[PDB]
Amino acid sequence: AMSLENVAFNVVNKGHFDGQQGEVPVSIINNTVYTKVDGVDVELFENKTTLPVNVAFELWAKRNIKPVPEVKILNNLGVDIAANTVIWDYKRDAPAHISTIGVCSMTDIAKKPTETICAPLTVFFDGRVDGQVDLFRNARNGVLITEGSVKGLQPSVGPKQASLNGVTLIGEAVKTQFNYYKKVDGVVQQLPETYFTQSRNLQEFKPRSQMEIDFLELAMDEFIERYKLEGYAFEHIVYGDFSHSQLGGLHLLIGLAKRFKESPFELEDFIPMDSTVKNYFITDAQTGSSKCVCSVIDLLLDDFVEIIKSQDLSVVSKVVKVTIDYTEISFMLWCKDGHVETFYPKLQ
Amino acid sequence: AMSLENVAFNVVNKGHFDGQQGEVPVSIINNTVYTKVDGVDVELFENKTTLPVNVAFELWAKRNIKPVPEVKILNNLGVDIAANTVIWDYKRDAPAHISTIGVCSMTDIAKKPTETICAPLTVFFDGRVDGQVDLFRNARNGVLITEGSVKGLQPSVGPKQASLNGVTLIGEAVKTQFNYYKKVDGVVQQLPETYFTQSRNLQEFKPRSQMEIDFLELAMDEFIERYKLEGYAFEHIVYGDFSHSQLGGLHLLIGLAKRFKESPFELEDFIPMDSTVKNYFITDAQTGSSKCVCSVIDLLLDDFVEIIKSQDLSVVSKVVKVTIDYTEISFMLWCKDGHVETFYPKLQ
Amino acid sequence: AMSLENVAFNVVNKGHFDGQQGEVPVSIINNTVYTKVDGVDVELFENKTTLPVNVAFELWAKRNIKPVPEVKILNNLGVDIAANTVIWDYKRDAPAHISTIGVCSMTDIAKKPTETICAPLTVFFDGRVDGQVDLFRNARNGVLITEGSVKGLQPSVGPKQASLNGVTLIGEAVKTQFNYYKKVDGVVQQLPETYFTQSRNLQEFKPRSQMEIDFLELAMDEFIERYKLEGYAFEHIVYGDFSHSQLGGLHLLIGLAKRFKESPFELEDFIPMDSTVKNYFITDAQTGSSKCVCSVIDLLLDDFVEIIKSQDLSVVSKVVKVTIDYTEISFMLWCKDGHVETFYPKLQ
Amino acid sequence: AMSLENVAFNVVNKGHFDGQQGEVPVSIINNTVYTKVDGVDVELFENKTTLPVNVAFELWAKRNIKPVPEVKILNNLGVDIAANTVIWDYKRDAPAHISTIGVCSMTDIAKKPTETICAPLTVFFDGRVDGQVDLFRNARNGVLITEGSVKGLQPSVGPKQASLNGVTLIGEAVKTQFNYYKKVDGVVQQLPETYFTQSRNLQEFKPRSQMEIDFLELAMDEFIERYKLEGYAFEHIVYGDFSHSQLGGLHLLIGLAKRFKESPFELEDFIPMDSTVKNYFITDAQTGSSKCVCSVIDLLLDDFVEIIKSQDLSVVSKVVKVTIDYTEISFMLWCKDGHVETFYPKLQ
Amino acid sequence: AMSLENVAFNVVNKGHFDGQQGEVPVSIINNTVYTKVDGVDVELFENKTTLPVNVAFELWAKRNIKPVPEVKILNNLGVDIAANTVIWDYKRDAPAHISTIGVCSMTDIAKKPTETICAPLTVFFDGRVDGQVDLFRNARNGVLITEGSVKGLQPSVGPKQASLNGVTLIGEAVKTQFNYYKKVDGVVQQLPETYFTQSRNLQEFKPRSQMEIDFLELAMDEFIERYKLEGYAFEHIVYGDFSHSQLGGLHLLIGLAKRFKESPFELEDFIPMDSTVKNYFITDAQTGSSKCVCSVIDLLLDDFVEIIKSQDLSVVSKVVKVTIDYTEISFMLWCKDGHVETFYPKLQ
Ligand SMILES: Cn1nc(C(N)=O)c2ccccc21
Numbered sequence A, B, C, D, E: 001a002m003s004l005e006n007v008a009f010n011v012v013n014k015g016h017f018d019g020q021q022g023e024v025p026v027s028i029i030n031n032t033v034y035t036k037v038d039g040v041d042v043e044l045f046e047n048k049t050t051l052p053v054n055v056a057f058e059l060w061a062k063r064n065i066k067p068v069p070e071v072k073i074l075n076n077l078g079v080d081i082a083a084n085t086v087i088w089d090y091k092r093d094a095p096a097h098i099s100t101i102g103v104c105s106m107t108d109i110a111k112k113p114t115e116t117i118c119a120p121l122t123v124f125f126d127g128r129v130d131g132q133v134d135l136f137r138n139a140r141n142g143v144l145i146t147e148g149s150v151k152g153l154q155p156s157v158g159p160k161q162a163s164l165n166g167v168t169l170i171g172e173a174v175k176t177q178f179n180y181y182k183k184v185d186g187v188v189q190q191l192p193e194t195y196f197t198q199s200r201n202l203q204e205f206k207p208r209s210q211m212e213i214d215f216l217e218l219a220m221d222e223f224i225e226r227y228k229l230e231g232y233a234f235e236h237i238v239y240g241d242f243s244h245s246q247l248g249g250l251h252l253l254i255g256l257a258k259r260f261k262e263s264p265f266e267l268e269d270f271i272p273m274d275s276t277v278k279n280y281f282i283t284d285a286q287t288g289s290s291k292c293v294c295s296v297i298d299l300l301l302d303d304f305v306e307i308i309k310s311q312d313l314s315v316v317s318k319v320v321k322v323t324i325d326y327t328e329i330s331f332m333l334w335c336k337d338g339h340v341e342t343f344y345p346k347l348q
């Protein structure tokens, strides 16, 4: 017996939908859900989605509260819908997927992923839920995550980090590193060799290697000398050039984090969504150097060094394709006299 | 187990709230309630009230579907709230009362009218519901309607007409004429002798006496002669004067109905609500004669003739108080040389 | 180059979307689309749909302006989506279907009905458009209308009437009677033998047979005598019983139309959508007789007489299934001593 | 001391803004203004404008309640703003002009039309208000109406009809025929000789000449014979051709009114505003004959006959410019062998 | 070919409007603009203006992305509109000006500033754009900024800082110090001698002189002694008095910044807009000392010392007018026995 009042009761008493019986009085005004507490209204939810307020409230209450793959990974793997859960997209304040399976009567296209409507869709399956590894076996299209091995299936080791209630973290008390499996038209795929983005924040950036510790601690010329990076344009690409009106390079998150410690800057996230490569309209506060579309990727500095050192530097310009987060990322590589001039995630 | 989805189920299947178990998917967008039918959204309700949409939807679904007193009568009797029902005000598309008793969790001030919060409020009681006459005997303040005798309680015969789902009618298959009773501060109050407004429409006006048939059929001078109305200013008051820029008189609904048959006119209902006396900004289409505040009352022509013929015509101006629909209506009576000049419901 | 301003230009200059190049300034405020004319905003469209205002405006501008099947027929045939057109539902002021094919970038699930997403959906095809009969032959699921013969395809003669810009009519200058064809799972399905509802209004009801002329002109007892309808409960079913608080029978539109000429009544259309059988909360103004759920069907009186006279009258109660508008309508037939007591479209 | 509560007080007590002191409690929710009456909210105004609700409420309360020129006339004369009044556009439910002079603090561009901001704007002046003829003499740009002679100013006799509170009428108790005057760049402009549209409705159309009575009463062939209209294509232009899918002609309101008596039809007013020529998407209910853009003008049939009989019929196609409501209306005249084929207000 | 979809395409791909061809699907819901990215909606813009959402989205996309004068400077100079650009007011999240010239079809009053509508308006001209110095030469009213000298015009050196995408900064990689020119009625003005506000933030306050470094580093009594400020009430005016319920003085930003390092406080910006003097409802968290209207100005401490030391201290109270940011700021100076008691930006 699903209801607005029952969903609200669960949110008030359990912090989310927990299948508990009960009802609380609710008022809906514009895009906000309120509940009466001692005669006064208390805001439970503000709808930031394009779904009707009561529908969005229910999907948000029914969000997955276990560590789940980051939306950018699910998107890159072609996930269309999730089996009997809601992957909440905290970057968009909305459901990661248009439709649901066995979650909400307004958004459900099926109650079970075995229904023929789900056969063409790449359904997300969670091996931590009983019967989902078997539902993936019977699924024509799908992506499966597991914590351990699956008999007869070769795994693709996913990223170390997962999203837990919108907090991207590498789990110590919970497992966040999953094995990934994918099926297309009934055939188990061999997932490609991939790098993973590190999903760090600018304000709380932490190095994850000795090279990253050295980048943040040493001065530009000492670091470039120590790691033999002369001729690889790290001065432009990673450190950033703030001497002209157009901000030069600054495409690796670690470089932005190093700059942030000394001088602040504005990053306008004009397409706010989870993605492998992020585009920002940056304005450096100290210098006034700015760039409308500054593509930024958070790779481990060692992985970025490996990518750039594995390229042919003999052509003026070329597209360099690198598998990152299971997707093909195109980079633009610009060279002159055997040295790099610039290397950036291609704006297309 | 009250819920938005259960209220919607009742509306879809029973035409209103009928206490039936069940749920239908609902979407709320802005001020409208929708339900999915054959894959598409069908509008169930549009909120025209100042309450939250889901709350107004529930009160409207729980509206009283039996003949009930017209809102103007309840207002005139000082009714604040109803016992365990919703009197829906079809003229305002809203609940006739702010709060409820045992109806909706968001608007309820009590579950039963015996609760101390209800003692100062004039509670409406319906003798057609088991135990409501007893609740009126125990209520400190209240208005009771019955279809018959209550032992020891002196009745007041109400109007012949009642509102059934927004249709004001004199019941033939249902009883619409009720006995009325009122209590103030624990004491049964004697309801005054009163006239009743006829609650007719301009477009479907029907005469309810031989005098009313004669007013609509006969010419002005021959009706005034037949009913000995010379010197009573019916030419001004009832027929209306359309010769000057300011429309003269036209305060009885029957006069407007007679005019409507020949020439149309605009009546701007600037305070849209049910009331004994209605104020309209009238514009006569044929002549361009207009009046910002034209007070109009729908009395039976015989009752209006009785009122005007029972007045002393020896003073220039005076207030004439007449009990109509249990309320004291003040009229302004203007005389000259023993004849009426004007007589109108006094604009406060 | 589809755009809001181009859609608005087409509406302003062509009365609808006509593929014309051009732009007009547009302002969107809340759910209304406006355009500047002589320095002031003029309303072009008010969104009554659950889609975003600019999206609903585009689908409405792109509505099919040729005579099209009434939405009740498309629904009864299981139509999910239309091929490269919008069937506008004038009863709901909304698109008859959630999604589109080659119409609008926001609602499109495909550009052509040959795309694999369309295979499971029943696509509506219009033989009057070049290549649509061929697309139906290749579609896994679909409904096709034509003005003539399709080689080798067994036709089903549809209703005489079609909807032209929201006006249901039997075409004299245009063809409104189509041949219908349906495919399920790649296989042409034989459409059943069916009656058709007449799609008439209560206020402008016109008889379409000598029997219907006789029902409206003749008194109840003489019509029943002339057409040998004694023992078939037409007094209850068709004429209606207004003697008790619950309105009896009154399930045929013609009976409501006959009553409407003498006494008015309120019909509350609580699920406002096009359907073969309509449910109304009726309140008779003359008597106060009312019914929360009064199922009403508009059959030709001759067709209803044929249905009722073709039933076995020897059982107390039974479900009578009749194909109407291609759908199986369940009726409840109640008999006593070989005569009908009641016969009504069964309330689910 | 202008205020929302004071405006509301004036509306409640005076039917409009009347400069009276006082305040009533007001609640604003979404686009509606409410006031408390007997403990419940009563709707005073619903904003259908693109202005903020409280601002639109004030302009509507301050609307001119005297007969004023119809908005189509003011527009045709290039009126930008009114001097110290609001011309309310009842066809758009909005102010006819964006800005005000001495009316409302939010919309005012000036308190008096003598302010330099008003010099480039064509200000509407009303000679019925003291000092407005003088303000017109001093205005650089303006339109003046008067009920009589202004010394030395050559008058233009306007239409017989004016708008009084949204009712277009020819005044009997008030004057609706004004003298018009216009100034451009400090210089009094000679207004051209013009025809006037009759501003009639389809549903309440009344003939205003013996020819118009003869058009409505007589059959097509006998009217054309009586008025010697053979070869002028009245069969197409005025009567309308409903034999093909595209509705032919039907450009004079009187022809639509004649058709309306026999068969109803839908007129979609897709640009809802007052204009000399109106464009409708028409659908004839009887035949299914339709036209996306059907230009309709309401001229007196005698005036239309005079216009068409005053044209040279020797060229295949040409633009015929006719001054109507002070504006140049372009008509398309199509001839063959010395006879008219079609003549219609040219679709721009 | 301007369009909503084209503006959205530019925002998605270029970070702002860049004149690029292309379209993306857009949905408008309430006041938010979304775009579809891989089947899900992504928020592009939330309207915080009083303009229609699609219009505000276009002006925001077309905002000037070069360093521009701060809105307080433009306002103080009487700028009404900008020539072919949008000065976006980041403090109000809205366009700094009501109308535009050659920017957006809904807000444009002209395509070029040479149009006669622009002659009375003080048009903002940017010498960094080709032809704008010449358009200022031909403009009757205007303000011109340049980076270098203009032949024949004497410059007014503006502030060192400018706004770059809402970040107020003193440019190192870009020029932010402009020469200002102003014309009124065709005559080049001699701009007055002025101080400039420093436009610093409380949280990231940086000293811009040795005196400012000393104010932040030294204790109150050491600083007052070093700079000979005894008898100038800096203890009250600049440091602030937190000993009584009403917070005393605290009118210079540097004093608030010094306090902020030790104890936090709430500044309620009740009129959120860019202005030379800002008014805050301050509440000191440590003491509970508060003030409803605390006027705060950010002057360089040396400039404030120069202003206060250049006043006559012999009268109880007087208005001291100081040109700051080209506007006349009134200060209230209160003295006793030849010493200052208080000196503050006058609340009027
Ligand atoms: C070997 N194998 N294990 C699985 C599984 N655990 O889901 C599966 C699924 C499809 C095809 C082969 C498979």
Ligand SMILES: Cn1nc(C(N)=O)c2ccccc21
Pocket: E133, E134, E136, E137, E138, E150, E151, E152, E153, E183, E186, E188
């Ligand atoms: C001498 N002079 N230079 C300019 C200019 N560059 O705009 C100008 C403008 C108006 C009047 C005199 C002027």
